[PDB]
Design a binder for these strands. Sequence first.
RNA 1: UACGGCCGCAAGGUUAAAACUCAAAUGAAUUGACGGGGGCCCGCACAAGCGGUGGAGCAUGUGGUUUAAUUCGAUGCAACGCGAAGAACCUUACCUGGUCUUGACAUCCACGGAAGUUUUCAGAGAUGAGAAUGUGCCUUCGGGAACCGUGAGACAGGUGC
RNA 2: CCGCAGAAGAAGCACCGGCUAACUCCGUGCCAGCAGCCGCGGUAAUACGGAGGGUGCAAGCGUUAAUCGGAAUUACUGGGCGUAAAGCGCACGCAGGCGGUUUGUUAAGUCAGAUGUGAAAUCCCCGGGCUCAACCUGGGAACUGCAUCUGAUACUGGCAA
RNA 3: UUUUUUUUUUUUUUUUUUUU
RNA 4: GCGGAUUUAGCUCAGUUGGGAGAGCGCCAGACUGAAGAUCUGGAGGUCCUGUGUUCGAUCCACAGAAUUCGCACC
Lengths: 123, 206, 205, 150
Amino acid sequence: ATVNQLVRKPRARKVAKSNVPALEACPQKRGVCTRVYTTTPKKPNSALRKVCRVRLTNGFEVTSYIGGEGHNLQEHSVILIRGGRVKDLPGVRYHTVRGALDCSGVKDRKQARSKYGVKRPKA
Amino acid sequence: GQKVHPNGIRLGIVKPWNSTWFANTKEFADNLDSDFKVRQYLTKELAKASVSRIVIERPAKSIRVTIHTARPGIVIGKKGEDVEKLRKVVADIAGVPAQINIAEVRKPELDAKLVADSITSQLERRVMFRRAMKRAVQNAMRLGAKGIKVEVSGRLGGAEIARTEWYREGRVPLHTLRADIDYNTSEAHTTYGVIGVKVWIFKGEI
Amino acid sequence: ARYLGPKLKLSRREGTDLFLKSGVRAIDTKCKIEQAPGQHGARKPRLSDYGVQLREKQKVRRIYGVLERQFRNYYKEAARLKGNTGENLLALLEGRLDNVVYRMGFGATRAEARQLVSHKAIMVNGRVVNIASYQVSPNDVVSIREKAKKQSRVKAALELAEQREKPTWLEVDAGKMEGTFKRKPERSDLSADINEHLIVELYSK
Amino acid sequence: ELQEKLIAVNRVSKTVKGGRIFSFTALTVVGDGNGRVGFGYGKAREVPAAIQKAMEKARRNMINVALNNGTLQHPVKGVHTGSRVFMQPASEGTGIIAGGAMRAVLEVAGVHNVLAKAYGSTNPINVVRATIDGLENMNSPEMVAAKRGK
RNA sequence: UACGGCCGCAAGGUUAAAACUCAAAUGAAUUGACGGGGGCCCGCACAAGCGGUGGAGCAUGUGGUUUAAUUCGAUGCAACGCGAAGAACCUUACCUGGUCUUGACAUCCACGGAAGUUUUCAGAGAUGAGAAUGUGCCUUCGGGAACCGUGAGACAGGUGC
RNA sequence: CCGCAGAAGAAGCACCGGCUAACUCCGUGCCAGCAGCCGCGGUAAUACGGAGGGUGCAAGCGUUAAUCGGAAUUACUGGGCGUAAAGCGCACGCAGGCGGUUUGUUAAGUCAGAUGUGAAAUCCCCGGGCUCAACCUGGGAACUGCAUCUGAUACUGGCAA
RNA sequence: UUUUUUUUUUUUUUUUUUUU
RNA sequence: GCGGAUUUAGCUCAGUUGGGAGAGCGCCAGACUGAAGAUCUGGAGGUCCUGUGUUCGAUCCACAGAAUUCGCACC
């Protein structure tokens, strides 16, 4: 009831705190794959997830999550960028709808329908 | 927060027995054993007009069975052929004769029990018995009583639902060993789980 | 695109004595109200203050067989119109082409009558207006065409409506099958048991 | 043939020394269909007992609202600490489009052409108190015609 | 709070703008936290005092030694002599080995049986291999009892918090 | 449009919490994951992720980039000053705002009118032509101001007292 | 209106579904 | 047409062209503890991306195929 302590976390369970800095135009964008990483020891033992950096002109350096299945998301590519920074990721402030170019994304996952854009199976 | 029998604690004071018999030292065990079985059989015969009081006397181990039901004329039979039958199957377990005496439930509306057998019948229709539950209590209360409280616990909704509801069509002095009060029960199912109704019928003061 | 059936499933929730199938055997004895129409929750369902208007949009949407399309495009102009919600909306669904022909008896069911009117078996003063949202205004006329005028289904209607209440708002001929609305329908005698204002208050919630 | 409805309730159950306590309350309205409206509060050890005690108090006299015919001819002030409040009649032909937070207190008498939703507060108690205590302050046609005649 | 300069002796005064970022609360009024408050008290709380527990030796359950290897849950006021009031047949933990998974116990039908007393040799116990002695009550000679069988389909259980 | 030939040739996605709206059988362990305000998952996950059925609706179904919704907020037309925010310790005078209220007079603003502008597709109403929804439309009107003048005087400002 | 008889005591996790 | 490096325990990666391997984090566990932590201890995790042949013996080699990737031959 002492509001300066109380306001931080109190009874909501979506808890609205999200930190999403930087602007300079709009959030829905194209993002160059610049330079790949898979470095950094953390608590979530993140496996095979190549989380790379993007050359966004925004006043500081930034990074993006791999946004969906399909292992090849190479360093020469340029995908779409959007919000959705799961609790799992430090530093990053976006994810990616990544089956543009040659990077493919969903392979034969019949269930994916309107969520990614796949065609029908054997009826 | 307590359930509290007015009945049983006070047998001599307006609330007579379910059984009054006498076995000595060694002879108690098979009497008592049979006192569940003849009771079992009788209630499944009677259920077409229930059984308010199910009175097992034993004048000499052999059994003066005294049965309050709303409609005697269906256990009498077409006159005498079920009175033969019952007297056979209630003596058989005991090994000794059982003198099947009837009585009529003097208007079911006023009774020590039949208020619970009306409400638990409705759960066999499987539709929304709530339309008929407060009603069937308030009807029986125009034909007798001064207060009643009624409790239903059970599976009364759908899929995973178990909850419990409480209702008061008059005041209830909860234990009073001088008053005309009755506590009682009855038990239903609805293809999901139990529906067990209980009553406290504050009929009168003394 | 207007839902097609299971047609008696609509009765098992929209309720008793609907027009959709008026005619034979099913009525009461298999639309399961008072029996238990939704068996699993049958023990203790509930309603809502909004929900109970929602089932009455549903009454109007399924008893007449019209899309969410039309419910919006009849209400569109009902803010320009001058009377009550019952005139502005519910009357029109009672007198659109596929509904008025049922009412006179050119079909036996309020789901058959739509199929008829899209099959070019009816006209409006000559117009074979299969566009069955077209609404037939008073003292001008609706007829079954020549080569469909006494055609089996019509007599299964007209010999069966004979024992029932025929309204005065409209007039027909039963032996050469043509007619009109002789006045505007009236929220008193329109005989739909509906609280005719619920379906626009449902926008205000 | 009087009409008898709830409007509002409390959860009203707190911590102490010591474990928890609880209560059962009610705010209810009653009326008589020629024009008469009223209101009453109560409490008990139990749910329907509170509703009972509350409706029993709600059954008291009921103010004959100045209706001619299906609805009423002045915005009579429902004066409270800011509710303000007033209602607005509609042209006797379209419904009771009032605030579902307080509509009860006019549907218990079947007032068919009155609108206004919950003006200055998101609380049904705020308006339902404001109304009945300012409805007693109504004037008849013959009273507004003495006020502007004799 | 500064990034032009109006003023100021320099520190600052004063405009109160803005990069960007992000999720509601300030006020009432109601708590009572176990509280060497004011105050009312009161109880071996404390008194005045009585008998003592202790150091060394003895009956003994954890820890901890590490033993070949270790069984729960015991850790202030809500726990002590565990439950165990007999942890070497013991109501079996457990270390095992010897049998099993309708099992030890108990039914509804199918074909059949009279029920038991006494030693000898094996075997750690369960169980194994023999030798003699016996034959009951109704009695429709039917159906079975006391009471023992093998063969069917259904079918058995435990302190798990 | 009129005969043959056949229901023939024409449908599906969100999904299923709770918001308008239908729920369970199961999975993987704050895995992978939607992330809009809420809500979900911390080995019993009603929508994460699979599946069974059914649902909202039907050339449609969810959802997205922005911003007002609901929500009352820059308020001549529309306002709150104990609250969010909220009469700034303090007023020397320089411009500025209100200048005491009525007679005899005046109409520039006030208000009503006559006449002009707004050819044609408005907004808002009807009548219709196509089979007709649409569409194609025609007819009926209303336009604060500004113009040029006729008046009517209660304010706004003036003039003489 | 003189009111220091010692200063400190880790996170959890309690929390009986739900529309009314 | 080039052919080279990195890929190691669930993650990160030390380092390794033949005797086939290594640390912390995270994971589970014997207890203390309702469960953990204070105090006090225990177990691993793989034949180094993998498969045919070499070879007495493979992550290694010859050799092909996968993942991270590289600039040039590409027009």
